[PDB]
Design a protein around this ligand. Structure first.
Ligand SMILES: [Cu+2]
Ligand code: NA
Length: 107
């Protein structure tokens, strides 16, 4: 958790939309096994991709407005942002290797 930004409705524009470089945002909530599945995977990816990628989480129960703005329809959903825009979407739990494949394809 040392390299993961916790985003909110109030920080999203500064932390994500105005940020430099690609930002991977995990839309998640409690009572979601698949969300838990990717939590440790995200710490690993944040470390291995440091300097090329920023990793962040947005809890959709705590920040419903932002979840609605990006049309979250299931959790977890990973949105990859570049320059304030959604570059790519990955729905559901996946392995570390699968997440690396998604990132490498879109970076
Ligand atoms: Cu950490
Ligand atoms: Na998908």
């Amino acid at each position: 958790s040392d390299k993961i930004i916790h985003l909110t409705d109030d920080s999203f524009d500064t932390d994500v939309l105005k940020a430099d470089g690609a930002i991977l945002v995990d839309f998640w909530a409690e009572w979601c096994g698949a969300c838990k599945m990717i939590a440790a995977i995200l710490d690993e990816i944040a470390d291995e991709y440091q300097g090329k990628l920023t990793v962040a989480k947005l809890n959709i129960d705590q920040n419903a407005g932002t979840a609605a703005k990006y049309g979250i329809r299931g959790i977890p959903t990973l949105l990859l942002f570049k320059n304030g825009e959604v570059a790519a979407t990955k729905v559901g739990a996946l392995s570390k290797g699968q997440l690396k494949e998604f990132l490498d394809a879109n970076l």
